[PDB]
Amino acid sequence: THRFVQKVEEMVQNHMTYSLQDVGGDANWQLVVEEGEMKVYRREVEENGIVLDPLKATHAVKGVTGHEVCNYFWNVDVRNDWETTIENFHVVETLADNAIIIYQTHKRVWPASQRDVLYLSVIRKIPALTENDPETWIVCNFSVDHDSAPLNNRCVRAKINVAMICQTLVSPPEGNQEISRDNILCKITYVANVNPGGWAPASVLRAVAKREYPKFLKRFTSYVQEKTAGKPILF
Numbered sequence: 435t436h437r438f439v440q441k442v443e444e445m446v447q448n449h450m451t452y453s454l455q456d457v458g459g460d461a462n463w464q465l466v467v468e469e470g471e472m473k474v475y476r477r478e479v480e481e482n483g484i485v486l487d488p489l490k491a492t493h494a495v496k497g498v499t500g501h502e503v504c505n506y507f508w509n510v511d512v513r514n515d516w517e518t519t520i521e522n523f524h525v526v527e528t529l530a531d532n533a534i535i536i537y538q539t540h541k542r543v544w545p546a547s548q549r550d551v552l553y554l555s556v557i558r559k560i561p562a563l564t565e566n567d568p569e570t571w572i573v574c575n576f577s578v579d580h581d582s583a584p585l586n587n588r589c590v591r592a593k594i595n596v597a598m599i600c601q602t603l604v605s606p607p608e609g610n611q612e613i614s615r616d617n618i619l620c621k622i623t624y625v626a627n628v629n630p631g632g633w634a635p636a637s638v639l640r641a642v643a644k645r646e647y648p649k650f651l652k653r654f655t656s657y658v659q660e661k662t663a664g665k666p667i668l669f
């Protein structure tokens with residue numbers, strides 16, 4: 435259907451295989467911030483003195499479904515309502531109704547150069563592995579090469595591999611009666627592997643990650659709750 439179908443499959447399947455694992459029991463992940471059910475972990479990793487620190491967070495959001503969370507995360511039309519670190523954004527290519535390529539710039543983090551990013555953003559539903567397991571909605575955003583990448587001399591090109599992975603638990607329907615948002619919970623695993631693509635001071639990037647990832651998860655999840663309240667559920 436498009437030239438990135440196989441790459442998309444590999445990237446999604448890699449998150450399904452490796453990103454969903456629990457890390458509460460795993461001393462190799464450092465728990466850096468906890469705010470209720472929001473648990474943010476990282477590993478301290480540098481390659482050539484540049485911070486790569488894999489980030490992984492879990493959260494549990496009442497009253498929204500994974501399909502809703504993923505749609506709001508993927509939909510570029512609502513990006514401005516919840517993003518706080520983007521300066522500019524351009525849709526570079528549409529590949530499918532569920533997959534686009536995006537160019538964006540982030541606000542400068544002093545004293546490093548501003549960063550830009552060029553990535554494929556795809557939204558997929560993954561069927562239950564067995565009839566015991568939940569279905570998964572996943573958004574994966576991962577860097578790719580493209581010819582219609584802008585010249586932007588202020589920016590160093592970062593590379594990313596991010597996934598927002600959601601499983602939704604509900605009270606079953608009681609005969610002919612809908613499920614209430616009161617009885618729905620969206621379990622989130624969010625992972626972010628960012629390569630700043632060049633020099634940046636490690637302590638500054640680590641301090642920024644520690645602040646901004648929790649702020650993002652809080653703001654974004656609250657936004658989804660706020661926008662879906664009193665609207666019919668989209669499972």
Ligand SMILES: O=S(=O)(CCO)c1ccc(-c2ccc(C3CCCC3)c([C@H]3C[C@H]3c3ccccn3)c2)cc1
Pocket residue numbers: 519540543546549551575592594596626628629630634639642643646647650
């Ligand atoms: O979840 S998404 O796919 C949503 C679509 O945007 C996502 C989230 C985060 C990033 C990102 C990009 C650049 C940086 C660094 C690299 C050197 C200088 C800036 C960081 C580190 C600094 C951390 C951070 C966390 C949250 C928001 C912004 N900043 C993060 C990209 C995409």
